[PDB]
Design a protein around this ligand. Structure first.
Ligand SMILES: Nc1ncnc2c1ncn2[C@@H]1O[C@H](COP(=O)(O)OP(=O)(O)CP(=O)(O)O)[C@@H](O)[C@H]1O
Ligand SMILES: [Zn+2]
Length: 255
């Protein structure tokens, strides 16, 4: 939008309510060194230098992912234009040294986060002691960065900066890592209210602002490599103890 030295990116937002991706551009400036890492990715402080349209960067085609029918022809409205306005401090995440990553996985992961965000709203609507919220997430094609040896463009995901102490409350394979009730009751709520079609675990973040969740489904399909299917779900069942939040939401002690 307004520049000023940084790098260009193709910015992708998923909107669940119209079931389409919204394609934009942005400029960002990222720090050279990461400020945190996990098992898979490193996270980098970044500043936004504005969000604009994708008009200078034609799509193609010939195929494409996401496919053309999954892309909105109109991109005038989106969260990115407010949440990533010029001057915003945010987080960029890059995979560490990865051959398990594919273009399709970046998009699966961001869609997954958007799905959990809808679940957070549905939870909040039953009026629990502590409302919860999932951060937006976005796919960025770092188009100014040179493709590595394989010829693949550089991709990353971005999300807002969380301020405070970052805590993980459950894992994607049955760990209950804090004594807080809301995160565990939310996981249980997603399982029951979805009629056992899915569960949201890996509940982590700062307070009840959450990021990087994981979904399991009975058939194991979609939701990235962390979808552990029936094993994942059952592992949650084994360690769940219902709490006051579960009871308040009228969730069945039988899972
Ligand atoms: N939006 C955000 N704001 C501030 N810090 C964040 C953040 N998202 C992640 N972090 C921090 O960066 C670390 C690594 O990021 P992330 O957790 O996404 O890596 P990962 O994909 O390897 C999963 P894990 O760390 O659980 O193995 C987190 O453990 C947390 O400390
Ligand atoms: Zn419960």
């Amino acid at each position: 939008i307004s520049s000023e030295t940084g790098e260009m990116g193709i910015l992708w937002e998923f909107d669940p309510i119209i079931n389409k991706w919204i394609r934009l551009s942005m400029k960002l400036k990222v720090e050279r060194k990461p400020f945190a890492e996990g098992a898979l990715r490193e996270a980098y402080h970044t500043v936004s230098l504005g969000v604009g349209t994708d008009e200078n960067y034609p799509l193609g085609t010939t195929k494409l992912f996401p496919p053309i029918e999954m892309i909105s022809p109109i991109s005038k409205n989106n969260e990115a234009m407010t949440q990533l306005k010029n001057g915003t401090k945010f987080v960029l995440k890059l995979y560490k040294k990865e051959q398990q990553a594919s273009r399709e996985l970046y998009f699966e992961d961001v869609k997954m986060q958007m799905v959990c965000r809808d679940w957070g709203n549905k939870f909040n609507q039953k009026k629990p002691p502590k409302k919860i919220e999932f951060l937006m997430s976005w796919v960025v094609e770092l188009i100014d960065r040179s493709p590595s040896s394989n010829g693949q463009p550089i991709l990353c995901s971005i999300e807002p900066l969380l301020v405070g102490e970052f805590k993980k409350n459950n894992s994607n394979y049955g760990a209950v890592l804090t004594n807080r009730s809301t995160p565990q009751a939310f996981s249980h709520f997603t399982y029951e209210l979805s009629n056992k079609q899915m569960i949201v675990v890996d509940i982590q973040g700062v307070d009840d602002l959450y990021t990087d969740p994981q979904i399991h489904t009975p058939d194991g399909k979609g939701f990235g490599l962390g979808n552990l299917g029936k094993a994942g779900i059952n592992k949650f069942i084994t360690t769940h103890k219902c709490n006051a939040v579960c009871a308040l939401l009228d969730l069945d002690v039988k899972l």
